Amino acid sequence: DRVAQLTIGNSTITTQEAANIIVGYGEWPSYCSDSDATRPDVSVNRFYTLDTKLWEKSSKGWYWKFPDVLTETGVFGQNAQFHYLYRSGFCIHVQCNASKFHQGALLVAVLPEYVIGTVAGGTGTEDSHPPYKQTQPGADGFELQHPYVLDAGIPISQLTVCPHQWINLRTNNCATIIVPYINALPFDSALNHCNFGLLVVPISPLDYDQGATPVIPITITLAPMCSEFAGLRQAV
Amino acid sequence: DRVAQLTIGNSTITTQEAANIIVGYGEWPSYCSDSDATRPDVSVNRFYTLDTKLWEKSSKGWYWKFPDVLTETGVFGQNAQFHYLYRSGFCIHVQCNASKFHQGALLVAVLPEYVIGTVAGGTGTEDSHPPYKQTQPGADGFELQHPYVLDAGIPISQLTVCPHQWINLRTNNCATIIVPYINALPFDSALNHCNFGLLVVPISPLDYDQGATPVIPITITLAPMCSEFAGLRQAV
Amino acid sequence: STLLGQLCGYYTQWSGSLEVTFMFTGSFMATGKMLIAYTPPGGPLPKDR
Amino acid sequence: SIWYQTNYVVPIGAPNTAYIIALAAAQKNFTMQLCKDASDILQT
Amino acid sequence: HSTAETTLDSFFSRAGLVGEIDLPLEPNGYANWDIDITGYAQMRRKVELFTYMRFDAEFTFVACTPTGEVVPQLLQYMFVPPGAPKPDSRESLAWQTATNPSVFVKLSDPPAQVSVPFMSPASAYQWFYDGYPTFGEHKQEKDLEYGACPNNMMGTFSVRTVGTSKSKYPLVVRIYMRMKHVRAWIPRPMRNQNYLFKANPNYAGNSIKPTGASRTAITTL
């Protein structure tokens, strides 16, 4: 139970580092000094604290999509709408708070290029494609439908090849992943290419005795890293 | 007889330095580091080129009021809407273009605390007061009504006590004024306290022979200096 | 309620920074997190977090 | 402004409702300027 | 040889008649003189030559009958600082609260004179506040919140007789005021047209006059 005092720019969090440490892809976020074939320091670098999503016994999972998560909310969103070209890293910090009398492991894992797919449905049709509000869910995220196949015919059983950290309320109450910019191009549109998709999956389902608050939250705190831009557009 | 190549950040002007150089109040704009009893350097500092107000033979004058001029137009306007506290300097640069066959001197001068006043009248009643759209006219500016007294019982004859530069199409076709932050307080609302008010008044009226494009413009290009802000608010 | 507030009533003009300390009084077991935000004069109370 | 960022987790025997005390004070750069007297009553 | 006479402190430091207070026999027993360096209908222009100013001031109180007779009365002059409450009536606690300084002199005594320091939260007075006070929004309706900077408030002066029963002698109280340690700043062009409102430089557009006199033609005298 380390003491907690963490603050930057204007934001201020209260976390710890006494158990789980830090997991990266094997490469810290950095800049580029190439031929491409503005560097905000005093505003963007602030802990944007998302909305605490609840967690029932009969939950299925959740998933956000960077940089869609912020594209419609925040100062970052502003200098994202005006720009067309984008590049950054992220300091995702997923934190759920609950008693010792609760239990239920989670799988915090980052899946780059999360192309999803839904069930063919309707009434009798053959073709359909996921709506804009499922490929770009936004800050609220989207509780997915079929966890076991990650809405892509992709089994969770092997997700651990990607960066992950377990949250077991017995042991761990903290999750921290640092993800670099990962793309075939050093720059891409922040609007039309949702990069990696963060997702939170309960494997060991939440359980409790009766009368123990049936809803333990998941506070998501994230921070961009080493953001970089060049040419700009005009404001309204 | 000089080449013109003046640029910063993104903006780019085309001036000269063949006549008078620069007129200031006697003090370059600077910062502050005391007990009071954010500093954008790579964005605010851009040459805002206003709209060229025309000049007929029978015009009477114009006057803008800083920093209102920019507060509702531009990135500068933005970090004025979000912030509450303000301090900056200005590099006012007026340039009018006309032929050798035109003539008519102007008096470009900056009047700090341009408290103006309108005529009482209408019906025979005694009191009426200048509107918000005359006290803060904005970028478009405002054609003043009674020049000789500057709509304030203030004779032009003595305007030269303030920073000024004459524009005579015979000699000089350019004017450049630098104004520092001038207030009883090191910070004031940029929104509700328009500091110095720039005004441009023709004394020797524009003249020409008939059929010679009777309208010579006044291109105003300005750029902030040593801007300073403090506390910030959230975005819409 | 504060002594500060009362003394200020024996004066007119104030000036300076202020500290505000919150103390939690719940169980050792109860957890949860809350947001405390300061908002400068211009601009009002924000509708949502 | 104070916001319920999270739910209130209450194991089993914790009260679902708890209370918070707020303490306030001025920093060392606090200054006042003008003496003036306020409202009190004082009878015989 | 010297230019000290052309200094601000030689240009302003003269006690002028600013306040004329009438204390008749038969109204309630007091008067309130909101301090305005005006009154002396010459100081405005002499002051409105500048924008930002700073000074402490010495006040002097001359009291007599309208006859000019000197009468054995005992007055109470009271300085009421800004923000502090004003006297509601003759017997409010504003007279005894004593936070508001008080001057007790007879009239047989020579005029009590007192100095008042510079009392603005701002670094200097303003005669011009191009804008609306902090923080001017909308929902206005009221049409006075322009060019008014309350940072220029110097407080108020009040007089008694004293109570409880009203005096017998008709009184007038002359208030004389002088500036000290004056420091002006950014210079204004001097007024040319007649005033109409206080705390506002409006003018009569129908009736504009030339700054100075005029001739019939340029070639004549």
PDB file of N, CA and C in Angstrom, chain E residues 42 157 206:
ATOM      1  N   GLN E  42     -13.010  72.665 -12.515  1.00  0.00           N
ATOM      2  CA  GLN E  42     -11.831  72.999 -13.284  1.00  0.00           C
ATOM      3  C   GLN E  42     -10.845  71.856 -13.172  1.00  0.00           C
ATOM      4  N   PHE E 157     -17.359  61.334   3.255  1.00  0.00           N
ATOM      5  CA  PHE E 157     -17.255  62.175   4.442  1.00  0.00           C
ATOM      6  C   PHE E 157     -18.644  62.487   4.994  1.00  0.00           C
ATOM      7  N   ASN E 206     -25.437  68.080 -32.285  1.00  0.00           N
ATOM      8  CA  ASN E 206     -26.073  69.222 -32.923  1.00  0.00           C
ATOM      9  C   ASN E 206     -25.236  70.483 -32.752  1.00  0.00           C
TER      10      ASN E 206
END
